[model samples]
Target: PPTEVIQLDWWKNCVLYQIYPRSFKDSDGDGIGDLKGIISELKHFVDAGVDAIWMSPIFESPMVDFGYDISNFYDIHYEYGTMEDFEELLDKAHELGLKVLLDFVPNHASNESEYFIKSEAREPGYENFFIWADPLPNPENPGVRLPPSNWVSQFGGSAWEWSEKRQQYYLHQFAIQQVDFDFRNPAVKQEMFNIMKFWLDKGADGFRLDALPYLIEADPADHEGRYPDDPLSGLTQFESHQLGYTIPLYTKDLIELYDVVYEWREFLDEYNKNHGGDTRVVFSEGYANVSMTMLYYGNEDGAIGAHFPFNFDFITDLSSKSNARDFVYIILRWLTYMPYGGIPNWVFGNHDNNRMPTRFRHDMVDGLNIINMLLPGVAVTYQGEEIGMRDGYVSWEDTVDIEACNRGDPDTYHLYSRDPARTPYHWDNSTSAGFSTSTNTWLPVAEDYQEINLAKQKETARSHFKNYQALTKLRKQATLSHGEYDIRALSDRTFYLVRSLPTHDTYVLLFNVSERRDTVDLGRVPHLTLPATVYVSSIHSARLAGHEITSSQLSLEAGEALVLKAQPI
Candidate 1:
């Protein structure tokens, strides 16, 4: 009961699912996932016990670089459905008790956007809306000009694109078509806040602010062409346009980014004060280091930012060879370093990277899920992770990611392609994995869909999907929130994981990290007692719920794990 107040925030210990619209499901046989398709599948979230859903950008776009480049702020993308469909989604989400967070891409807009077009045309109010710089002379070549700085695009080469109409080069951190917005202008900030208000007025929960690190760049206040070059990274393998070649000091995680978020948080608070619904929650998306990521919550002088900035150590810090000790540091660092009252989170997969099952192994999915559920804060999952979906094989010809496609050389494009993870979800074993009625889905369903899919996982006695469902159920228990926790690498391949409360059932995760049957005993754990019952187990583990064990000693075959509930003495 003591922990009740601390856990009052709905996001605390909640499950958040990320849906990539292109591959989620299709309605009207268009082979594209639309709002209606998502609305039809609202039951899936309920069945999985998800508390909230965060969808990637669904706004109007030219699709130059997938759906992220927003061309229209006030309308939905025609391919995904219309404004009516979105309103229905909001109504249904609220009715089903599910929170919806829209992906807010504030750093830039598509070059095709009216604002950008107007800016290029040198229209009065919008003239300075985008970051524009004059080209510097190239000393090495008499007749040529170069970008103001040596910054490179996230897609591949130079960050600046020449605009013939304006006779100036514009900064585009991403593709040439996605021009960066100059947030230095107060009018631009007001426009962004207005966009947020339009959505919140429609009853949407909050936003997942995108590209937080690049909100502001070099202010060219007085000097015309004095943008300094970022230091070169000491690496030789990267292409001339690759960002790996430069340190990107001026382009990323700048000091101004923190205050910009503080302003947004102020906006959210002001909105909540006026409308008075369930507290609006906001989280940030960025690939900055842990310290910078933490600062997203706020600076020390009383400015509030995002409720949380996604902690990426779980994705960036670990590899297949990492030991259990490696996992502890990633976990401990967030709990230790985050600002006071800041919530921690576990994010295993997203649209940009490879899926977790393929990144780690199908064998490790259950173990990781158990860890995700038992943690103290939010657990975020990309769609299809519950069934342990693997990345589909995308042929070189089918790869169209801007980063990969820009490589041009088919031989090396595969190295940068993320198409494998963006494959359609396998709802069943049918053609196109039952993701769409049409055979020609936007992206191919993974080849192994027949063997690894939601339907098959549901029919099986033991499976990752069922295990994940069971864990979600267990995550709601009081002990998981109010309990004391301990994690130890009992051996190089075994873990002594436990969560206990003096008055509630203490649950311990039984797992083997290696590739063979391993013996484990937690008799030495001071907080644990003898006689525990199996609460949940993986597909490889046939043990039933409430199955009794007399002692802390047991053997777990590789890829096997379970939650055992022990009564405190």
Candidate 2:
């Protein structure tokens, strides 16, 4: 840690608006989104009261992995814009008083990158630089022997790739072109550190490290060469460890991996010390399912990176009241562990999956939002989620993803048109949804953009846009921003609206989850009052007669989420 580490205060109460550059706007009319495009559309994020914006990788790449695979770390991709345009974007964002975060794909690089190409030349020193090994005895494992010892690529298939030119195999954690660089190689480590310094010098604020935890190798053997060949065997699957020693299986020679992170963190601390006192953050992308294990790579508490190795734990799992309550419980667990005892960061939607509003269906928004708001942490807002944009479908002819080329899958596969959310910001009912004056954009704007643009919502008080606005605004208020909480437990299907304030202001965040009204004993918690203010609900008006509410409760229409708040006696 530096004299003082980066405080989580900026993010603790902050809401981050994620911008997929290629879809936000097209200012230069190149049928693509660029820095200027984001500049023009950035006001929406600003007005929404977000503290920061996480822009997807905007670096120069072959576009093989859609900017996730970098060919050059230093300049802007021509397809997106020039360096000056990026500078303008930084200036504009900073002028708006927003902290900006850029995506950094550090786990691997495109095969065509200079480093990989040099590593492939088979010079004596280059062998260990990129995990290259000659074809093993198992021919079917590829022309090469084994796949970096059973580790599978996230997209599909072995994490290893065969190379005829070098007559060897190399680890390609993703598609063959997207090769994993061996960070254990000192030269590779220095280069990555240099890349970080270059970007920070360019006014970048922080980094969102992609596929971070998987940066290490999946070696099957120890120095004595003993360990079983399990499908999932690595530092990731193991629980607990000896202080500074390596065990044969999961911990076998894994010190190199920790060394890599420690060194890089040390370099970053230096960067922060030198760069404007503007802290540099390193948040890892760990895909663990459980909340506790999710923190294994430091996704919880003050791990080396300071931020947890996070995953989208809350988005896909909120299907039932039990699940919802459990989700809140898990969040509380993580928050309780923080060095500063701050809330965790949450992501509802991103490029990888369907939007949360659509995934959960419209019925869950209010309850989810209420729980989301009441929870302690920063929440990320995906574009078009406020308007409830569903997943976009595209025909094979309209697709632009490169992964489809390797898999022989239809181009339209895999939310190819993340370009859809990337589509122009819905400002008004203009021909291009008020996104661009140009007739054609990089991706087609949604047809309903006219009826569903942001302009109409800003004017319409009851619209989803305004609702989110109110929720975020209320969250900003002193009472809601950062306060202690007292949670009330819920029985199976029904739960009371139970939150007690330090000032003795008790509130009932009641929920039925079902259409039919189920009664709870009002006498159980007599300290509760009558006439609950419906803070939010999918149900009918919260009718409380007096000190007691009838057993015959108001029927909450199907798919309704209601919120109510009142001070306790």
Candidate 3:
């Protein structure tokens, strides 16, 4: 047998749960979720066997782009709670054996920031805190100046916005209210480190670096440094002002971005030696291809980047129409491209993306959760997805997202608005889904909260919650962690995977992605020895756990999944 390995680091291969603080829970009836509300729900994390909790931006903000646009990195948003309350949260979570990771918005800050205001006024020491450039001369129209390049904002139109006071344009890759920080400045770099230190000293475990790919842009060597227009995408689906209209070669995944990550990694590593508990992790959030994603783990020059660069291929690639074979490809692709010593992860949903049940089929919830937990890596679950929650209904009149307001009109806002996914969590079947005592919440609770919720799911014997609990516990076994993983696509509609280790029970996963029935024979599969017990199954199926499967032939229904446990050879 191969040598046994035990990981000292808690961050390795652990389950991470992402919380959208704004919609998570409201303790004070302010209709907005706060720190105390999250503390109240710490039991839920413990229930899911989650090792770490990664929260979205909770820093002080003007709420323009919700909390992503930070006004102050040193303080917590008053609406969310005070800094004292935040400290209690950190203390409480640590006491519960759950590590906490605060979201870090290093890319940009809110326009209302004191530093931005100083920079706008051309004050000393803050003059270049942000990215600023003079407009390029326009030969077609004399005395008229155009923006530096044809760059498009992630939210909408021109990325460069004219600043009346400075007589120069500034780059805001996201909403205009969220200005990009000049990473080129040495002061700005130190300030980012200071902001991180402020929290590290306050007992934060680590951070999830937000919008990591846009950390660096084309260099402005001098006043004459000009950026060329990006190449057109040649696709008609995106609007002219949309980010998708161009290839974004200049704004994203620049080679120097890794250097910034490396700097933070160095800072965190040193911070660990002094404080000394667990290895503080840097979990990055970037949506790049396999090769580009690996760069965030560590660059070519041997610099360590993010501990978990966050594999998002599952979120971007698969859809309801995708086949079982397609799911297999996404799994294999990540494992194939993952660099040496890289920690891979599976991301199903997030604050920016659609909920899994609404985006995919509801019946596939347990199946997907099985795949997430059974894999030999980290599994990140968005809040409310554990109970198989669907997206809430959000009308244009109730739209709160900057992307929807800037990109779509009243008639088309539904196409762009992320409001549906950011609705309040459904804890129970109370008047307001137990999220708030008041119905006038910041956002409405989902429609199906009555029938489908955490309270309702837990009351049942068989459900997504139960399957998740089972899967989470099962994944800790040596067979699941150190076993030889065998993945294969039985057909376009069916998938089969096996996990085997010496002196441990072998596990097999069989899934049917299509609505039509599929018959799979385990006897014919080389990995199995038949006579296995049904360890767990999809909630949509009637297949009971602990039932003996003496026969090799099995029939599966729409979205049905079966995890079988067999004796070691």
Residue-level lDDT tens digits of model 3 in 20-130: 999999999989998999999998999988889999989999999899899999999999999998999999999999999999999999999998999999999999999
lDDT score at residue 175, model 3, on the 0-100 scale: 96
Task: Candidate 1: list runs displaced more than 4 Å.
Answer: 1-7, 138-142, 222-225
lDDT of 2 by residue, 1-569 (tens): 11222344575667777787877677776667678878876677767777788888898888877789888878888888999988888889889888788888877877877777877886666556676754444655555354334445545455568887887778765766888777767877877888888877888777777765567755534523322233342465332221112222341224355456556667877777775555666655555435333443433334454344444756555543333356446455545554454346666777766666556655555555555555556667787766655555445665565544433356325533343334556767876776677767655676677667778878864566655665576565444554445444343434443444445444455555443445555445434565555555441334421223334344444444444555544
Q: Stretches of candidate 2 above 4 Å error?
A: 1-8, 122-128, 138-151, 219-259, 276-278, 289-303, 320-342, 403-425, 438-444, 486-532, 535-555, 563-565
What TM-score does candidate 1 get on C-alpha atoms?
0.96
RMSD (Å) of each candidate, 1 decimal = 1.8, 6.9, 1.7
**Worst window of 10 by summed lDDT in candidate 2:** 239-248
TM-score, each model? 0.96, 0.80, 0.97
State the local distance difference test value for candidate 1: 0.84
Which segments of model 3 are wrong by more than 4 Å? Answer: 1-5, 222-224, 237-239, 524-526
lDDT score of residue 235 within candidate 1: 91
Worst 10 residues of 3 by lDDT: 1-10
